[PDB]
From a paper:
This behavior is crucial in cell division, motility, and differentiation.
The majority (92%) of human α1A/βIII GMPCPP microtubules have 14 protofilaments, similar to brain GMPCPP microtubules. Despite the chemical homogeneity of our sample, there is no density attributable to them, indicating that they are intrinsically disordered unless engaged by an effector as seen for the tubulin tyrosine ligase like 7 glutamylase or the NDC80 complex. Consistent with the high sequence conservation of the tubulin body, our structure is similar to that of heterogeneous mosaic mammalian brain GMPCPP microtubules, and the overall conformation of the tubulin dimers in our reconstruction is consistent with a GTP-like extended conformation. A difference in the tubulin repeat distance is observed between α1A/βIII and brain microtubules as follows: 82.7 ± 0.2 versus 83.1 ± 0.0 Å measured from the EM reconstruction (i.e. model-independent); 82.6 versus 83.2 Å measured by comparing models, for α1A/βIII and brain microtubules, respectively. Nevertheless, we find two subtle differences that have the potential to impact polymerization dynamics.
Numbering used by the authors:
A (entry chain B), B (entry chain A): 1 to 37, 47 to 437
C (entry chain K), D (entry chain I): 1 to 426
Amino acid sequence: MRECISIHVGQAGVQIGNACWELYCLEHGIQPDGQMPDSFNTFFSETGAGKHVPRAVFVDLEPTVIDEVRTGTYRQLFHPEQLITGKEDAANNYARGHYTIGKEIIDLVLDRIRKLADQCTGLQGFLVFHSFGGGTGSGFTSLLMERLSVDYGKKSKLEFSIYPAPQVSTAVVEPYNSILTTHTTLEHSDCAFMVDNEAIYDICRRNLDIERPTYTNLNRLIGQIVSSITASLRFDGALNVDLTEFQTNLVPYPRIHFPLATYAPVISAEKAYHEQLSVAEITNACFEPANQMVKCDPRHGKYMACCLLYRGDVVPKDVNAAIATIKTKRTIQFVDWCPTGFKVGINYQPPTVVPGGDLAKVQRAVCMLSNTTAIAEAWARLDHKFDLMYAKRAFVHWYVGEGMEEGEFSEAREDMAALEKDYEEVGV
Amino acid sequence: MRECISIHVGQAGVQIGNACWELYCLEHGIQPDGQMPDSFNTFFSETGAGKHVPRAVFVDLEPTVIDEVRTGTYRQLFHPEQLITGKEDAANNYARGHYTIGKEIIDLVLDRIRKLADQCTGLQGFLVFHSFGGGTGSGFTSLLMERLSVDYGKKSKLEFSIYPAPQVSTAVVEPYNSILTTHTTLEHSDCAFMVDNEAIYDICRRNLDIERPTYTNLNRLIGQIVSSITASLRFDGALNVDLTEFQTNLVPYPRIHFPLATYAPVISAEKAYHEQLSVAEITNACFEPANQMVKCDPRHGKYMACCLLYRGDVVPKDVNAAIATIKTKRTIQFVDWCPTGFKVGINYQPPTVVPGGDLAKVQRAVCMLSNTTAIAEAWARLDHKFDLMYAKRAFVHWYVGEGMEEGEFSEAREDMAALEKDYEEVGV
Amino acid sequence: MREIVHIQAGQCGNQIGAKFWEVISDEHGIDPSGNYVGDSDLQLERISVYYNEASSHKYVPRAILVDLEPGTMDSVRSGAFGHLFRPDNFIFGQSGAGNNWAKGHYTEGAELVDSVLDVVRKECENCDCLQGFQLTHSLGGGTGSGMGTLLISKVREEYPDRIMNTFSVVPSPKVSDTVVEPYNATLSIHQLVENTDETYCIDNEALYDICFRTLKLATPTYGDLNHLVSATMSGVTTSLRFPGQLNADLRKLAVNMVPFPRLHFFMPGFAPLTARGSQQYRALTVPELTQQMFDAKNMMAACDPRHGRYLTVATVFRGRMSMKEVDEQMLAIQSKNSSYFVEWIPNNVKVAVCDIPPRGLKMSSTFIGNSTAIQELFKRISEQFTAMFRRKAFLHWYTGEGMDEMEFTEAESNMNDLVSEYQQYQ
Amino acid sequence: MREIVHIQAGQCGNQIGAKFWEVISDEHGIDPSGNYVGDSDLQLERISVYYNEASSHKYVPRAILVDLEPGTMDSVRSGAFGHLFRPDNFIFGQSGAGNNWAKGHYTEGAELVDSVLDVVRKECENCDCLQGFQLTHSLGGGTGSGMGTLLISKVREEYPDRIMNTFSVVPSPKVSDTVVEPYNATLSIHQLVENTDETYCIDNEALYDICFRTLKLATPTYGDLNHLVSATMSGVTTSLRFPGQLNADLRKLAVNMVPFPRLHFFMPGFAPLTARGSQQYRALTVPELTQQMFDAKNMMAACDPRHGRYLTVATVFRGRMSMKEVDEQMLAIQSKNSSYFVEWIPNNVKVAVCDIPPRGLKMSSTFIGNSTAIQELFKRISEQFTAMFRRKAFLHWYTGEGMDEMEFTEAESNMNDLVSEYQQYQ
Ligand SMILES: Nc1nc2c(ncn2[C@@H]2O[C@H](COP(=O)(O)CP(=O)(O)OP(=O)(O)O)[C@@H](O)[C@H]2O)c(=O)[nH]1
Ligand SMILES: Nc1nc2c(ncn2[C@@H]2O[C@H](COP(=O)(O)CP(=O)(O)OP(=O)(O)O)[C@@H](O)[C@H]2O)c(=O)[nH]1
Ligand SMILES: Nc1nc2c(ncn2[C@@H]2O[C@H](COP(=O)(O)OP(=O)(O)OP(=O)(O)O)[C@@H](O)[C@H]2O)c(=O)[nH]1
Ligand SMILES: Nc1nc2c(ncn2[C@@H]2O[C@H](COP(=O)(O)OP(=O)(O)OP(=O)(O)O)[C@@H](O)[C@H]2O)c(=O)[nH]1
Ligand SMILES: [Mg+2]
Ligand SMILES: [Mg+2]
Ligand SMILES: [Mg+2]
Ligand SMILES: [Mg+2]
């Protein structure tokens, strides 16, 4: 049992899903048709004689992206009714995503979700992929979250949010969308793992030696993180970790559930033969600011909770020693009210290699989930961004005309402020 | 354990390193790829299945020289991130090396250094190669030294400085660069081994029968000295010597740590068959002014401390007798406050022969490290050189415009004077 | 899904529109009388955005062609590629307005309107999902300015929530092909103010300059000039017609680029503007394109962006690129000389990246700027109006068609207000 | 890394520059229209110092070509190798200065400047790392002298820390191709004084002498003369373009050779100057080269180093050598006749040794001397100025362009001061 279902919302959600599912297929020896040539049960169902099918749902208020899915390398992996499309997009308008356009498609997707749940025996949770800056990825996601809360108040819901750093912003109204959606997210999410594009880009240039990263490139890395996360559910380990565990171990307080995921080692084909790939070494890499997937000012804050998910050939003793060493380093700071900061998980599967990929085959790998106070700074900058725009009512007409009232914005701002204050408090 | 790491700074530093590392590879049966076909552990790490990799770091504020390294016979020996380059050189300006241009690259190299340290188990020290006359080799080196002091105040740091004699000067502002850097060096170096180009040239013509020495030629000899120095760390002997020992045995007083290295025998392929290569003979050669690697006026001063590092087939008794004989000679003078002047070290490895080389295979060899008061004269001449130039503020504009103040020069001069006085004192 | 109605009113519109149709057909592999010669499934996939499909796999533009003067219609049909248009979409009056806006807006326009309305309704009901409208026309003449605005108004009454786009050619001070341009411009711009979501301002003078100095051409024809406009048009809507890495439709741009309802006049620019002899000495690349797009020389509206500030900019790039590279370029543009970027809007750049480049070149960019410098254009016009109106010159013709002094006063006032608003935010 | 901008102003500059480009292209294996015919990876490695690289592996100089007279531009293009230059880098006015410095510096130069500035900015922003500038021009004419200096000033305002190099041809007393040379020289040299890091002084008379007596040629053309200059130019920058044993860039030489900010006028010399019939009777070697370089005959500036003293000398050698040999030669030169070497600067010789020799010969040397003998050149000019200025001759033309007596007085004063300074240190 223990099955888990993926929901992909908006363009970002879809394209990430594309990579992830591809990766999964390669991992379990599933060809792009669906035949195999059990463990995988947690992500793939079976019907017919030999064909395997993703427990996944793709949602977009526009057909463009999902049309490619329909007519691509993986057309035969998905039954057509797990792809929902067809309409006008929430044109980077949260309100449209939430009120006008979300209203028309919600029931269909919810039915699908229910069906998927019913197919399975006692699934643990949901993995939700989206951006904060998109009208669909913002407005619709919140609505969906609400629905999920209503249906299964008990069950775990994890998300992968594509978070915008102000210097690499591609959309004008990113601040409004992010703030409104984040408030809604707050009450119904168990934890949200933030990813920053800029950080990814940086990683690509420095540690993969690629000057020109495409979106396609970026997504691969993200997929690997996902794989690392859920490998313990899919495979036999020495010490295991589940979705329930993460919620338990990362959230000191209800409101403070926004941790950063980092990954290592990230190596080109060339650099590996001059690389002593150590357990300690990768751990070390994990706590160096250049390896963060969110640009956050990590050294200024303190760490509250840290989960280290190792995969490949590992000696637990060595891991322990590495951890000890890390603890002993002075500059890295944990909160004084938590002496013991690391949840440790081990997985016997070596991470996989994508045909035509950027990443070298490695024998030891690690994904760290870490919660730091420093991430509050990101919110502060976002709030600052919001505050000036709000001041002149810039772009407000678009939102008001979509059945969203003006005091709502104010409320959201207030909430964000309170959240920020909270981080400041808990760090003492 | 006991590993040691090489740092190469500026053009001189790089090219010396090139020869040295080549020599090392030949010695340990390492082909130019990295496979072998333990002892060597102190200089080479291992990663992967069979590949060995230099614990070395190459630094240059300009890509020219290190680009050749990247695309040469030894391209595959170094991982690309142990070579740091790319920018405008300190155009023979100490200030640029130290202030403007050193500032931008320092962190990257320091991180690399730290990584290298972490890879190893309790490394003893650092071997730093550079010139005094170069803007990079002067200004940057001091900065690096500072950093090293900050990080590892305890550990040993040895240097190979290419020192300029006034008659074979190739750069206009050699005096300023040398003086400024030397002051900085003073506080953070355990000992600095001076090499003079002119002396090398002389040696080449007389004892190798080559009228036209290239820089490439010169470096080989220097590399041999280095090998002789560190062979005791890398190999089994009868009586051994380490980096710690040198510091102990050569430095009567904190400030007086500038000894000369000499080497013998230096023989063409032809001259060897008419050569009775004796232990005594080589010792004798060692104390003859024509064999000095610095032009210093050796007979005028006194010897304070002398280390003799033998390698090859040696009978300790014979060495002892040779030493006794040397002591008995009247003209060679030791300081009256040290009766016993020689540290003796033995190594079972015959020194190696470079394919296409100038040097004959020999069965007995010696490298002498010797500290004499006479070297103070060199500083006096340098100071004289400095004093006239300073008098007219010649070339001062270049330095002042790089964030260096004028009183600094004066201070440096004062320090040098004091140092000179000190040598005069201790010789009584 | 996401289907569009094209409309061309007056001489300029009709000719520009023709060029546009030629371009887009070429892009999607459609021949003039020939049904289909396309090379790729992608082209096929989104034909239904701009076209309809009769029996035996024929294809036909959702385009409407309008003019009070019959002659231009004749020209359009007479050209090669003229057989592709459905004959029922040719809707012309009998006698032309003769650069009298009032005639365009009252006497003949009103008589013309009903047929047009009927055809538009027919077009709408035919198709599943209606996205927006695209009108090409002038502000200097009687038909394009007067009737066009009436048509727009009518459209608005019918479908309040649908997208209105206009590509409007504008008057220039040194070159006036009509003496009554101040009046015509004024009246039509007022009308635009209330009923359009986004308006693309285009100058002939600028185009001429581009042809002369950048493309290094001695003999520019109208067709050549129109080409640029056509290209620009194609660029805007590339997100609707192709799968990209990042997609931005008409609505998306509108939402992104209009901070206040009133300020919806966009200045287009385009890259790369290469010459024939000169092209082989350039490395084709993102940064170069970006640098080209923000030069005052490549603003199609004859205003200097140096004397105003950008509120917002949208950048639509075609061909394969590194999004990262693009973003970094944008950042560079912003931080280096933030002197002309408004502080209260933090990130002023919008990016869309579409995978399919135009025919001819491998990478290309369209730039759509909402600049406060546009006020300068309005100012000169206002001044000219003031100059004329004080002496009551040429008022009599307009009076003869129903107009009265008050209307003129009101429109001018509105224009002034608009100008003031732009200034304030600068 | 370490990328350079070339500029050519006025007739002389344009022609010399052309020659230089021909030489350097030849060296790096580039054909005139042809993209690449290079024989070695080394050539490829540092193409980006002087060139840009468009599609299909084409290559193009970062060179700007400027003149107030259109004719010379025509000549340049019309020559073989003319297709390699980017057409946008041809920036010429309409009417020439006619040896009126004031015109060059005010009336036409000012009108010309903006386009030039824009192109230079474009060039800068295109490239990752900007090293320096190289201007070729005259001090005897109106454009090269007047406009050039203005351009330099402008450049300085923009990038204060970047390297300024100029290759300046100088007036000679017996041969004057213009009667107003004293004035022109004076005004331009003043301007140079404040804004240049290093200036290479070159005389035609000297070149002629070299061609006649050393190369044993009866019929020297301008091209032949220019050849030497081109070679010299190539020599200076060899450290940037090739891996050597010892490397010295523009900055390195500058730092080494300028003891005081004011004294930055370098006298170049070159070796070996061999004749056609005479070459087979020499053993090619370091010592011979060294001996040749310090003869008064091989000073390209028409001054006798016997009547002054060297402050500093830089020696750039190309081809394989024994550095030791070179050093010993230098020592010999110094100690034997230290009579003309300043005492307070202990070692007056700078050495750079680069592995790749020019096409034709196996070993070669360029000598760059900072000699107090250069004061002699200035002195004659000063005298001539004095002679003219006392009678107020030809002042009227200069007055007609904005100039006033005071400027002349000031420049002359400055020159005098400079002369005095040189003397003092001798
Ligand atoms: N961009 C272009 N602008 C044009 C072209 N032809 C004309 N024009 C401009 O349009 C202006 C007038 O537009 P029209 O020729 O369509 C006259 P219109 O039909 O709008 O009204 P009437 O004059 O009553 O027929 C004129 O002043 C020109 O500046 C063209 O091919 N391209
Ligand atoms: N080394 C060279 N010197 C030259 C050449 N042609 C001319 N000259 C010298 O340059 C001096 C004048 O320079 P120009 O011919 O460029 C005239 P310029 O453009 O500087 O100003 P205008 O006279 O106003 O055009 C003249 O007195 C000659 O002594 C040449 O090919 N090579
Ligand atoms: N990591 C990642 N981010 C993406 C990708 N595509 C888009 N984004 C980000 O998502 C945001 C844009 O919103 P979309 O994800 O397109 O939102 P949507 O839900 O499709 O709604 P619209 O944008 O209105 O179509 C920006 O912040 C982009 O940086 C992708 O492939 N990978
Ligand atoms: N022994 C030896 N000395 C060298 C070599 N190359 C240069 N030198 C000496 O180094 C000094 C010149 O400085 P560099 O080492 O080039 O200094 P850098 O750190 O590269 O900085 P720059 O000189 O400014 O490029 C002179 O005193 C030379 O004699 C070499 O291969 N071997
Ligand atoms: Mg989308
Ligand atoms: Mg160097
Ligand atoms: Mg008309
Ligand atoms: Mg001329």
